[PDB]
Design an enzyme around this catalytic site. Structure first.
Site, PDB file in Angstrom:
ATOM      1  N   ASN A  25     -17.676 -13.171  15.245  1.00 26.41           N
ATOM      2  CA  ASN A  25     -16.978 -14.359  15.712  1.00 26.41           C
ATOM      3  C   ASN A  25     -15.875 -14.791  14.758  1.00 26.41           C
ATOM      4  O   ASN A  25     -15.986 -14.688  13.558  1.00 26.41           O
ATOM      5  CB  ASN A  25     -17.971 -15.490  15.964  1.00 26.41           C
ATOM      6  CG  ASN A  25     -18.744 -15.239  17.212  1.00 26.41           C
ATOM      7  OD1 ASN A  25     -18.190 -14.817  18.253  1.00 26.41           O
ATOM      8  ND2 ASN A  25     -20.044 -15.448  17.129  1.00 26.41           N
ATOM      9  N   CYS A  62     -22.258 -14.520  11.666  1.00 26.59           N
ATOM     10  CA  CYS A  62     -22.352 -13.072  11.609  1.00 26.59           C
ATOM     11  C   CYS A  62     -22.038 -12.640  10.198  1.00 26.59           C
ATOM     12  O   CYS A  62     -21.141 -13.159   9.558  1.00 26.59           O
ATOM     13  CB  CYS A  62     -21.316 -12.434  12.580  1.00 26.59           C
ATOM     14  SG  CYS A  62     -21.570 -12.932  14.234  1.00 26.59           S
TER      15      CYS A  62
END
Lengths: 317, 317
Positions: free
Chosen positions: B78, B1
């Site tokens: 994450n 991400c």
């Protein structure tokens, strides 16, 4: 510039055009009876038709890249300093300007072998299209659905290389770019084992550790490495659409955004456009820096043109 | 991400969602009178409205990221292993699940300072949404038109960092990410001088030599470095459209293509979608791995949803 090929459900060829300005690029279809004139060779009145990207000046198609009706493709990529264009005609060669080279090959050749043989007979001559469009140093990628070659004309000769990976960028010369990959053999798509030493408990706290060492900048050698790793490892698609999607993702890995590469002129080098030709169905797909949406056009004596949209086309819900 | 902010003609916030799967996601609008229920806190019947991206399960909006009607944004990224969710309630804190956190903040807070203050009262609890949707370790970027903060809840506490660059990825922890930038101080957008030694005539045969040293892989630290360099150096746009276009190019520099990052599950990590929120006019723009064309949606007691199209929408001439 970055040019690549891809073999999947069809066979593809395409490039990023990286420059610090735009020429007002457009799609140009050259039909079979558009007469090609040459500064030092007789005119070609009937030839293979072409579709590609470039500009038209004085009713002449100045292609940056193109394919022909047989699915043979050719792209000219910047090669400054190393490109060598002859100041004299050679009586034992065809004398062809660099701006004529794409017509000369794609108008007459159906595949890579025929392209190679015609390149073996050439002398690229140092004559510019016009005062306002002076020659730049270039080298070329020539591809068909089976294979590709690299053409580099330098002070030492007309060099033709088989391209085992379907990748080209800019300097250095091709054997140097290929040799340069050797030092990246240890890169991986998956998390490696700790080979540094089993005496220290090294920890992995994320994915992607296998690629550490891959270069991220936009120098031509780094782009060559990064495009090679990205293309060769890219997941196969199940359809032609998925392949074209993957192809743009691959070219995206070596895209130049405005601001990160400031040339000696003070201007920003950027990826003006990206494209993907489906060689088997002779269709051009492209995107531009300003417009993310992919545009498609599939392949008389008049040039037919379609100017690139430079506005972001957004689906508004 | 990767999550970023950008300040231009408007103010923007957005992210790449990188995962090795997707069962689809959708735009979700949560209106002001959708009743937010919490496992361990009273229900909130009247709150700020939200627009974001996520999935709906049991009529609950499980946001990956969202903004509210005041232009406050939050994204969950994450953060495996480092994230710490308490097994016990804390009687001196608000006890909020991680999947409730985006609602809890964005439903009630108009700006970053309010968000910070509410985070200072929280205890994140280890309670999953359901047995079929387990908790992942996450950390958050919270941003308004002025500034952003990072929230990392670990075994040592609830940590809130001012984010001086508007960039977040995955592990390691935020001070480590910021410290890591220091070794790249000599990267440049321009060709550097030969400082290696004046006794050897080093030659530059291409543009982009200034960036050599920039990491190109898709590890979270490399992406953090590469997104930072790309964002901070990105050229300014003259319009809001040019800003959005630039934002997608920035997120593109750290996109994960299928094939280059094979995870422990044997699947390929890839950028499922990319988005850009204009915080000032509360509009969500997004792209997906399968569809390059940007989709736009602008911001009752029921959720309103728009499923993401996963087909390449091509303009056929």
């Amino acid at each position: 510039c970055t040019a690549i090929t891809l073999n999947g459900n069809s066979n593809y060829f395409g490039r990023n055009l990286d420059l610090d300005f735009s020429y007002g690029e457009e799609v140009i279809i050259t039909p079979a009876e558009y007469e090609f004139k040459f500064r030092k060779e007789k005119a070609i009145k009937n030839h293979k038709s072409l579709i590609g990207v470039g500009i038209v000046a004085n009713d002449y198609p100045l292609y940056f890249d193109a394919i022909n009706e047989d699915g043979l493709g050719m792209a000219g990529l910047n090669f400054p300093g190393n490109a060598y264009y002859s100041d004299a005609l050679e009586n034992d060669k065809d004398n062809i300007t660099p701006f004529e080279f794409i017509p000369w090959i794609l108008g007459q050749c159906s595949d890579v072998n025929e392209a190679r043989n015609l390149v073996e007979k050439i002398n690229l001559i140092n004559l510019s299209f016009s005062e306002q469009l002076p020659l730049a140093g270039l080298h070329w990628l020539i591809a068909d659905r089976e294979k590709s070659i690299v053409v580099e004309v330098t002070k030492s000769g007309v060099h033709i290389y088989d391209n085992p990976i379907g990748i080209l960028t800019n300097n250095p010369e091709f054997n140097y770019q290929m040799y340069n990959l050797n030092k990246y053999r240890n890169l991986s798509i998956s998390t490696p084992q700790n080979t540094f030493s089993d005496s220290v408990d090294l920890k992995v706290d994320g994915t992607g550790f296998g690629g550490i060492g891959l270069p991220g900048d936009v120098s031509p050698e780094s782009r060559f490495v990064r495009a090679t790793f990205s293309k060769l490892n890219s997941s196969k698609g199940m359809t032609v659409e998925e392949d074209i999607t993957q192809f743009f993702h691959i070219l995206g890995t070596v895209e130049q955004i405005k601001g990160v590469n400031k040339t000696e002129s003070g201007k920003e080098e950027y990826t003006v456009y990206s494209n993907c030709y489906d060689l088997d169905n002779k269709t051009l797909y492209y995107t531009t820096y300003e417009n993310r949406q992919i545009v498609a056009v599939t392949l008389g004596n008049r040039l037919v043109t379609y100017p690139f949209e430079r506005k972001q086309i957004i689906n508004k819900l």
